[PDB]
Scaffold this active site. Structure first.
Site, PDB file in Angstrom:
ATOM      1  N   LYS A 215       7.957  -0.003   0.942  1.00 56.66           N
ATOM      2  CA  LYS A 215       8.631  -0.564  -0.225  1.00 56.66           C
ATOM      3  C   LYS A 215      10.008   0.033  -0.447  1.00 56.66           C
ATOM      4  CE  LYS A 215       5.420   0.817  -2.709  1.00 56.66           C
ATOM      5  NZ  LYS A 215       5.020   1.263  -1.347  1.00 56.66           N
TER       6      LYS A 215
ATOM      7  N   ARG B 151       6.605  -2.356  -6.885  1.00 58.59           N
ATOM      8  CA  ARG B 151       5.278  -2.518  -7.513  1.00 58.59           C
ATOM      9  C   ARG B 151       5.478  -3.188  -8.885  1.00 58.59           C
ATOM     10  NH1 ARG B 151       2.868   2.192  -5.876  1.00 58.59           N
ATOM     11  NH2 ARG B 151       2.424   2.211  -3.629  1.00 58.59           N
TER      12      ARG B 151
ATOM     13  N   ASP C 195      -0.452  -2.198 -10.914  1.00 59.18           N
ATOM     14  CA  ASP C 195      -0.813  -0.961 -11.601  1.00 59.18           C
ATOM     15  C   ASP C 195      -2.255  -0.999 -12.066  1.00 59.18           C
ATOM     16  OD1 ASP C 195       1.235   0.972 -11.577  1.00 59.18           O
ATOM     17  OD2 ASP C 195       2.282   0.073 -13.273  1.00 59.18           O
TER      18      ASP C 195
ATOM     19  N   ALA D 292       3.030   4.196   0.920  1.00 60.38           N
ATOM     20  CA  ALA D 292       3.838   4.489   2.113  1.00 60.38           C
ATOM     21  C   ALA D 292       4.008   3.312   3.053  1.00 60.38           C
ATOM     22  CB  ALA D 292       3.241   5.672   2.880  1.00 60.38           C
TER      23      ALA D 292
ATOM     24  N   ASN E 217       0.843  -1.192   0.000  1.00 59.14           N
ATOM     25  CA  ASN E 217       0.000   0.000   0.000  1.00 59.14           C
ATOM     26  C   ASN E 217       0.882   1.248   0.000  1.00 59.14           C
ATOM     27  OD1 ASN E 217      -2.289   1.621   0.124  1.00 59.14           O
ATOM     28  ND2 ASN E 217      -3.144   0.639   1.958  1.00 59.14           N
TER      29      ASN E 217
ATOM     30  N   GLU F  90      10.317   2.787  -8.350  1.00 61.09           N
ATOM     31  CA  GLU F  90       9.205   3.294  -9.110  1.00 61.09           C
ATOM     32  C   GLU F  90       9.679   4.632  -9.659  1.00 61.09           C
ATOM     33  OE1 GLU F  90       4.564   2.312  -7.944  1.00 61.09           O
ATOM     34  OE2 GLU F  90       5.772   3.671  -6.692  1.00 61.09           O
TER      35      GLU F  90
HETATM   36  O1  LIG Z   1       9.907   1.106   9.034  1.00 60.80           O
HETATM   37  C1  LIG Z   1       9.585   2.155   8.537  1.00 60.80           C
HETATM   38  C2  LIG Z   1       8.920   2.217   7.177  1.00 60.80           C
HETATM   39  C3  LIG Z   1       8.584   3.536   6.678  1.00 60.80           C
HETATM   40  N1  LIG Z   1       8.906   4.704   7.412  1.00 60.80           N
HETATM   41  C4  LIG Z   1       8.636   6.075   6.817  1.00 60.80           C
HETATM   42  O2  LIG Z   1       7.619   5.971   5.859  1.00 60.80           O
HETATM   43  C5  LIG Z   1       7.844   6.893   4.764  1.00 60.80           C
HETATM   44  C6  LIG Z   1       7.457   6.174   3.459  1.00 60.80           C
HETATM   45  O3  LIG Z   1       8.172   4.920   3.330  1.00 60.80           O
HETATM   46  P1  LIG Z   1       8.628   4.503   1.875  1.00 60.80           P
HETATM   47  O4  LIG Z   1       9.540   5.550   1.321  1.00 60.80           O
HETATM   48  O5  LIG Z   1       9.223   3.133   1.997  1.00 60.80           O
HETATM   49  O6  LIG Z   1       7.232   4.482   1.015  1.00 60.80           O
HETATM   50  P2  LIG Z   1       6.804   3.325  -0.095  1.00 60.80           P
HETATM   51  O7  LIG Z   1       8.059   3.072  -0.933  1.00 60.80           O
HETATM   52  O8  LIG Z   1       6.412   2.082   0.655  1.00 60.80           O
HETATM   53  O9  LIG Z   1       5.677   4.011  -0.831  1.00 60.80           O
HETATM   54  C7  LIG Z   1       9.308   7.349   4.901  1.00 60.80           C
HETATM   55  O10 LIG Z   1       9.410   8.733   5.286  1.00 60.80           O
HETATM   56  C8  LIG Z   1       9.885   6.450   5.978  1.00 60.80           C
HETATM   57  O11 LIG Z   1      10.866   7.114   6.790  1.00 60.80           O
HETATM   58  C9  LIG Z   1       9.496   4.663   8.686  1.00 60.80           C
HETATM   59  O12 LIG Z   1       9.735   5.697   9.339  1.00 60.80           O
HETATM   60  N2  LIG Z   1       9.801   3.393   9.188  1.00 60.80           N
HETATM   61  N1  LIG Z   2      -0.528   2.708 -10.951  1.00 61.47           N
HETATM   62  C1  LIG Z   2      -0.201   3.530  -9.918  1.00 61.47           C
HETATM   63  C2  LIG Z   2       0.986   3.484  -9.277  1.00 61.47           C
HETATM   64  C3  LIG Z   2       1.282   4.318  -8.271  1.00 61.47           C
HETATM   65  N2  LIG Z   2       0.391   5.239  -7.871  1.00 61.47           N
HETATM   66  C4  LIG Z   2       0.666   6.236  -6.750  1.00 61.47           C
HETATM   67  C5  LIG Z   2       0.717   5.813  -5.293  1.00 61.47           C
HETATM   68  C6  LIG Z   2       1.591   6.919  -4.688  1.00 61.47           C
HETATM   69  O1  LIG Z   2       0.787   8.065  -4.410  1.00 61.47           O
HETATM   70  C7  LIG Z   2       2.572   7.283  -5.762  1.00 61.47           C
HETATM   71  C8  LIG Z   2       3.891   6.579  -5.538  1.00 61.47           C
HETATM   72  O2  LIG Z   2       3.731   5.160  -5.624  1.00 61.47           O
HETATM   73  O3  LIG Z   2       1.945   6.869  -6.997  1.00 61.47           O
HETATM   74  C9  LIG Z   2      -0.839   5.269  -8.542  1.00 61.47           C
HETATM   75  O4  LIG Z   2      -1.806   6.110  -8.261  1.00 61.47           O
HETATM   76  N3  LIG Z   2      -1.151   4.408  -9.582  1.00 61.47           N
HETATM   77 MG   LIG Z   3       7.828   4.517  -3.045  1.00 56.60          MG
END
Ligand SMILES: O=c1ccn([C@@H]2O[C@H](COP(=O)(O)OP(=O)(O)O)[C@@H](O)[C@H]2O)c(=O)[nH]1
Ligand SMILES: Nc1ccn([C@H]2C[C@H](O)[C@@H](CO)O2)c(=O)n1
Ligand SMILES: [Mg+2]
Ligand SMILES: O=c1ccn([C@@H]2O[C@H](COP(=O)(O)OP(=O)(O)O)[C@@H](O)[C@H]2O)c(=O)[nH]1
Ligand SMILES: Nc1ccn([C@H]2C[C@H](O)[C@@H](CO)O2)c(=O)n1
Ligand SMILES: [Ca+2]
Ligand SMILES: [Mg+2]
Lengths: 222, 221
Positions: free
Chosen positions: A15, A90, A95, A12, A10, A34
């Site tokens: 990943k 992802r 997608d 944030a 999901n 990504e």
């Molecule tokens: O164990 C964790 C996992 C995530 N984050 C915070 O969550 C935000 C988003 O994480 P990520 O960049 O991995 O987003 P994703 O790639 O999953 O969309 C960042 O500011 C991280 O510092 C954190 O503090 N601890």
């Molecule tokens: N097919 C996709 C892939 C990613 N995202 C979004 C989720 C986050 O807001 C940002 C980064 O992954 O892009 C989206 O709307 N649609």
């Molecule tokens: Mg990301």
């Protein structure tokens, strides 16, 4: 010849944070992030921001672009890498069946847009996509509440307004596809792909020994 | 190995009408019509009609779809003696004539237009190098003529098309196919032979000359 693993999760969830911890965890592991940086800078315009601002208008456009870029970026990395493992942030699957799907189901894409989208998506994969078939998937699972925290935490602006409902909708989508394995696609082979599920509701920025432990176990059986 | 010719022309100029007169003049000539049917039928919705009804909203969508289909349709017929394949319009007229004019007309913003081109470039670069034209046949007609034939054909979505629109399209055609001053990203193009035929007069039953010039053209390829 190169093992291809897809990291799903999901918004944030963790990943990126996780994918990194692996980049260095072993020289023989390359990552394909990504290409978000590319969707937020299209001729000095943020297309991600445009969708989040008026989805009924930009979803299709945005979704289409996102997928195109994703593919190119991945087709890309497949040239420039003993025990080769490639990690995707992802995948074309999430997608279409997670985001694109949900946007349609939420009336942010009409019949015409959604129809075109899928036909295009099918064509794309059928074409420049055969070599992008996954050998495995890692589901970084986290509750809608946790992800919402990390969005607020990460601080990206276009996302600060995302409602828990969106999170929720996509969390269920994820579950049905990766956990339960109920959601079906047009890609028959995903029905036999291994799916490691990791609970990342707890911070793992400095407590991933276990996670990385399970990752190796997973990969050995591939 | 197969010669590839593209028939270009303003809306309702006579491409279809002409292209047919040819498919039946040599079991060696196959035609790849513009998939205008597939456009009008997308899940029981007319996307061509949607663009003409609110271009500021559907141009990008439509233009994108149109080109995608065009390519698939052409790539298709590509597979399956002195083989000659005739395309109704081409990826080039798609982008530098229609798509381009839609942008220049503010029906596509910087974001949409940018994405369109990048996608267009990628597309051709990819599943496209086998679609390179060996020639082009410009069916030239004044916007006035095209405007009347838009009535004679009777297609509904087009009945409201203004002459100025028809005019803007004409000049894009003129610039690229006659004065050859409009440049692309496909350098080979401006190096391709371009037969120009004046079809302002009805040729439904007076094409002996036209078809005569077509053969002359093709012999030098
Ligand atoms: O164990 C964790 C996992 C995530 N984050 C915070 O969550 C935000 C988003 O994480 P990520 O960049 O991995 O987003 P994703 O790639 O999953 O969309 C960042 O500011 C991280 O510092 C954190 O503090 N601890
Ligand atoms: N097919 C996709 C892939 C990613 N995202 C979004 C989720 C986050 O807001 C940002 C980064 O992954 O892009 C989206 O709307 N649609
Ligand atoms: Mg990301
Ligand atoms: O010599 C000609 C060429 C065209 N047309 C009419 O012009 C309209 C548009 O022709 P076409 O379908 O070929 O247009 P295009 O497909 O080239 O846009 C139709 O009603 C044709 O019958 C005609 O009456 N005589
Ligand atoms: N790139 C294109 C190609 C075609 N058409 C339209 C013009 C006619 O109305 C119909 C048939 O050519 O399709 C268009 O708007 N844009
Ligand atoms: Ca910027
Ligand atoms: Mg036609």
């Amino acid at each position: 010849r190169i093992k291809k693993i897809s990291i799903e999760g999901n918004i944030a969830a963790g990943k990126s944070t996780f994918v990194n911890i692996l980049k260095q965890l072993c020289e023989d592991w390359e990552v394909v992030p990504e290409p978000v940086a590319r969707w937020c800078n299209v001729q000095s315009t943020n297309v991600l921001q445009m969708m989040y601002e008026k989805p009924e208008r930009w979803s299709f456009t945005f979704q289409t672009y996102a997928c195109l870029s994703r593919i190119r970026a991945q087709l890309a990395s497949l040239n420039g890498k003993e025990k080769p493992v490639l990690f995707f942030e992802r995948s074309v699957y999430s997608d279409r069946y997670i985001f694109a799907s949900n946007l349609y189901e939420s009336e942010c894409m009409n019949e015409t847009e959604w129809t075109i989208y899928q036909d295009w998506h099918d064509w794309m994969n059928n074409q420049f996509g055969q070599s992008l078939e996954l050998d495995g998937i890692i589901y970084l699972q986290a509750t809608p509440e946790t992800c919402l925290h990390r969005i607020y935490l990460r601080g990206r602006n276009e996302e600060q307004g995302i409602p828990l409902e969106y999170l929720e909708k996509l969390h269920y989508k994820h579950e049905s596809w990766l956990l339960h394995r109920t959601l079906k696609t047009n890609f028959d082979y995903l029905q036999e792909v291994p799916i490691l599920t990791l609970d990342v509701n707890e911070d793992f920025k400095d407590k991933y020994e276990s996670l990385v432990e399970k990752v190796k176990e997973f990969l050995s059986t591939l």
